[PDB]
């Protein structure tokens, strides 16, 4: 009653406050910048070892090794240069949504419908990789796992929550809960001091790991958002949703800076990532291909049409030398 | 020239052989998605033979893995992409919900939602109607018109249940791609596993017949 109306009034006043600062005229800021033109990339290598649908991939910080997870029940670590398979970790629950690579290269993480974030140790004696830990406590389903350090990992679950754990103790050290729908995507800032999460509410929330409260909330999407990626500078992020629309938001402006959509695409976004310089925005649609947008100009600059099914995962190397796209076609391509 | 890179290549080939062998072994295992009403008759068919609980058994040289949905309570469309390509969906139904405090409308709405999905436009669904012991005497006492205003006929298992089956099997909108066929659960003569085997056999026959051409 009174409290709900007060909350509505606060929402209206913050909306007006952000609308007052909306002096973009962005049709006049990007016209001076010379367009990138048209880029062309080809599949330098094709990694063919999965015999089911692959769901996630993640690059290592060395920009050579990459982990890929598939429905067949095994996640395999690829040497991207030589197409070799370094490890073939057989996981317990065949249904997996996400995989992660530790920045140090020592551990990998996996999870999915089992509601368990399994952490495997690669660099060990005795030879084979072993399941180091099994983080448990989520009541939904694991959707995105990201590594902060070798000891801190942030996960997102389908029960409208995110958590920050300690791997050594295997307990939720911090819990973030402000969403009203299944949280589907999660992205860490380059400084790893804060992250952003997107859920079915068509709202992306910005959390700081140290505090635990949603610093900002961004709206504008009409449907569920499936992908979040941080801008390389850390002061912006991009969201791809099910309505064929990418939206670039800026943390300081607290508004929708840019929108990327075309009249001829109606299918949904599955993954979004930036290039090293942030000029290119890679979007993996459900049209069995990927698009490359000019981030500063919102003009479609390229198409990565090389997959025989929908592209489910998309990643860019830390040095920005290659883009690995994995699809339900059971192969992942590496474009350059 | 490739001093110990040759050993890395050999290791890759060896684990690739292991991958191929494991996948070939997995291709002989059939995955069955499971749905059903909440704690209505899900305890009956399971007697014939966290996030997700997978039940594994084997019947006539075929490994059946069954994944139920009663362990997860969330939005159905957000996990429906994970089950694309599953062999078949077993959707249990209880006939005691026609006069219950109502459930038939939700069940048929769920059937409509699941039979027209973006990913489930081709998967086949088996369905078993259970709790016939109650149905023996609840039909004469309470006519079936409570949930079927447009239906009128004899209050007997021969015709009323036939009408319910016809309505349920007509609830699908793409009827020429996915086959919807039914068996009757029996407390004695536990042949329901045999019917599941025959249904998945027919599903595989049609799948590879389509895949080979023609």
């Amino acid at each position, epitope marked *: 009653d009174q409290l709900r109306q007060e909350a509505e009034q606060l929402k209206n006043q913050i909306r007006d406050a952000r609308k007052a600062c909306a002096d973009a005229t962005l049709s006049q800021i990007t016209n001076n910048i010379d367009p990138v033109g048209r880029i062309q990339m080809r599949t330098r290598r094709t990694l063919r070892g999965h015999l089911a649908k692959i769901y996630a991939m993640h690059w290592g910080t060395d920009s050579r090794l990459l982990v890929s997870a598939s429905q067949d029940g095994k996640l395999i670590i690829w040497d991207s240069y030589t197409t070799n398979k370094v490890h073939a970790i057989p996981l317990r629950s065949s249904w997996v949504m996400t995989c992660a690579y530790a920045p140090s290269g020592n551990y990998v993480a996996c999870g999915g419908l089992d509601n368990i974030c399994s952490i495997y140790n690669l660099k060990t004696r*005795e030879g084979n990789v072993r399941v180091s830990r099994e983080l448990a406590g989520h009541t939904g389903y694991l959707s995105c796992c990201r590594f902060l350090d070798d000891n801190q990992i942030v996960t997102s679950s389908g029960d409208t929550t995110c958590a920050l754990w300690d791997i050594e103790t295997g307990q939720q050290t911090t819990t973030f809960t402000g969403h009203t729908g299944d949280v589907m995507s999660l992205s860490l800032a380059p400084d790893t001091r804060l992250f952003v999460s997107g859920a079915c509410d068509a709202s992306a929330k910005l959390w700081d790991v140290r505090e635990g409260m949603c610093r900002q909330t961004f709206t504008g999407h009409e449907s569920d958002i499936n992908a979040i990626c941080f801008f390389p500078n850390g002061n912006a992020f991009a969201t791809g949703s099910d309505d064929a629309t990418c939206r670039l938001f800026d943390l300081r402006a607290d508004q929708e800076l840019m929108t990327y959509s075309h009249d001829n695409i109606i299918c949904g976004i599955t993954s979004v990532s930036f290039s090293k310089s942030g000029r290119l925005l890679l979007a993996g649609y459900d049209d069995f291909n990927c698009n490359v947008w000019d981030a500063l100009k919102a003009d479609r600059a390229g198409v990565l049409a090389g997959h025989d099914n929908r592209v489910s995962c998309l990643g860019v190397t830390d040095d920005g030398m290659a883009v690995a796209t994995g699809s339900w076609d059971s192969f992942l391509k590496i474009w350059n | 020239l490739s001093a110990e890179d040759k050993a890395a290549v050999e290791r890759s080939k060896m684990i690739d052989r292991n991958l191929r062998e494991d996948g070939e072994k997995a291709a002989r295992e059939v995955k069955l998605l499971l749905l059903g009403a909440g704690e209505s008759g899900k305890s009956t068919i399971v007697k014939q033979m966290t996030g997700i609980v997978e039940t594994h058994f084997t019947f006539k040289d075929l490994h059946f893995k069954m994944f139920d949905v009663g362990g997860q309570r969330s939005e159905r469309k957000k996990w429906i992409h994970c089950f694309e390509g599953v062999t078949a969906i077993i959707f249990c139904v209880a006939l005691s919900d026609y006069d219950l405090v109502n459930r038939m409308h939700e069940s048929m709405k769920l059937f409509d939602s699941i039979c027209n999905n973006k990913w489930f436009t081709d998967t086949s669904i088996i369905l078993f109607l259970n709790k016939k012991d109650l149905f023996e005497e609840k039909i004469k006492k309470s006519p079936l018109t409570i949930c079927y205003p447009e239906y009128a006929g004899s209050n007997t298992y021969e015709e009323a249940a036939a009408y319910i089956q016809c309505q349920f099997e007509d609830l699908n909108k793409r009827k020429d791609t996915k086959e919807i066929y039914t068996h009757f659960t029996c407390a004695t003569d536990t042949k329901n596993v045999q019917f599941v085997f025959d249904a998945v056999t027919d599903v595989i026959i049609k799948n590879n017949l389509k895949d080979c051409g023609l």
Partner: single-chain antibody, 232 residues
Framework: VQLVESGGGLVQPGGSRKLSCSAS????????MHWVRQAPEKGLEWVAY????????YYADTVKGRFTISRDDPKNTLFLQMTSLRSEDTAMYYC??????????????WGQGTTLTVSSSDIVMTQATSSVPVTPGESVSISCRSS???????????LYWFLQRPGQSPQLLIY???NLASGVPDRFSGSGSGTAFTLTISRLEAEDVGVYYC?????????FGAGTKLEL
């Protein structure tokens, strides 16, 4: 991790003998296994190698034909059958585990070895210095000379530094000329270019007294240096 050698002893020349290596504590079937021997008063000499899955077998020229290396993965054992033994085969044999993928650490664990006494264009890893005076707390540099450039087109400089303490099995100090092995302290460091390598020790302590060997892995057969001995 544990590797135990057995089957040594006294053998008449021209006879045959079987050496067995029992493995414990690691996934034996995922490791290549080397037999490396050391003469009674000389350096290390590589004998034979068998890969994972027995898909590749290599021998040394002085032992080819007379020796046969095999493995039993289910029993976690490695076998070296030796025929027509000569006085030149009188040595202590070590069973060495190795594993090859992007970023692995081959030759990272050696067995205790067994003694066998018989009564009576390979890359030359030339070694210059046989001994240096040693004072604890100082820094010592050791040099290794290679007849061929160990740098490869993939950027890896396949040079390995091992240390053998008095009366002890050798351990891996450095692999590929710039990587410290597992458990070794940070005092040890390695550097160099093709055909010129250096191992440097800062703040020398005790237990570092021993023989330092440089080995190449650019191509079979693998060859060791003569050996540099540090004495107080």
């Amino acid at each position: 991790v544990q590797l135990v050698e057995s089957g040594g002893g006294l053998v008449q020349p021209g006879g045959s003998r079987k050496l067995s290596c029992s493995a414990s504590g690691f996934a034996f079937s995922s490791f290549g296994m080397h037999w490396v021997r050391q003469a009674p008063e000389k350096g290390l000499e590589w004998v034979a190698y068998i890969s994972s899955g027995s898909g590749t077998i290599y021998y040394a020229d002085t032992v080819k034909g007379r020796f046969t290396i095999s493995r039993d993965d289910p029993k976690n054992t490695l076998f070296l059958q030796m025929t027509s033994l000569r006085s030149e085969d009188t040595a202590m044999y070590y069973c060495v585990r190795s594993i090859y993928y992007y970023g692995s650490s081959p030759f990272d664990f050696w067995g205790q070895g067994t003694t066998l006494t018989v009564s009576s264009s390979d890359i030359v890893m030339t070694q210059a210095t046989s001994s240096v005076p040693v004072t604890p707390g100082e820094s010592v540099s050791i040099s290794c000379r290679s007849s061929k450039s160990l740098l490869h087109s993939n950027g890896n400089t396949y040079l390995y530094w091992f240390l053998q303490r008095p009366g002890q099995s050798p351990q891996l100090l450095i692999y590929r000329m710039s990587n410290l092995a597992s458990g070794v302290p940070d005092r040890f460091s390695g550097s160099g270019s093709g055909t010129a390598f250096t191992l440097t020790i800062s703040r020398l302590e005790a237990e570092d007294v021993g023989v330092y060997y440089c080995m190449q892995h650019l191509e079979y057969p693998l060859t060791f240096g003569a050996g540099t001995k540090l004495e107080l």
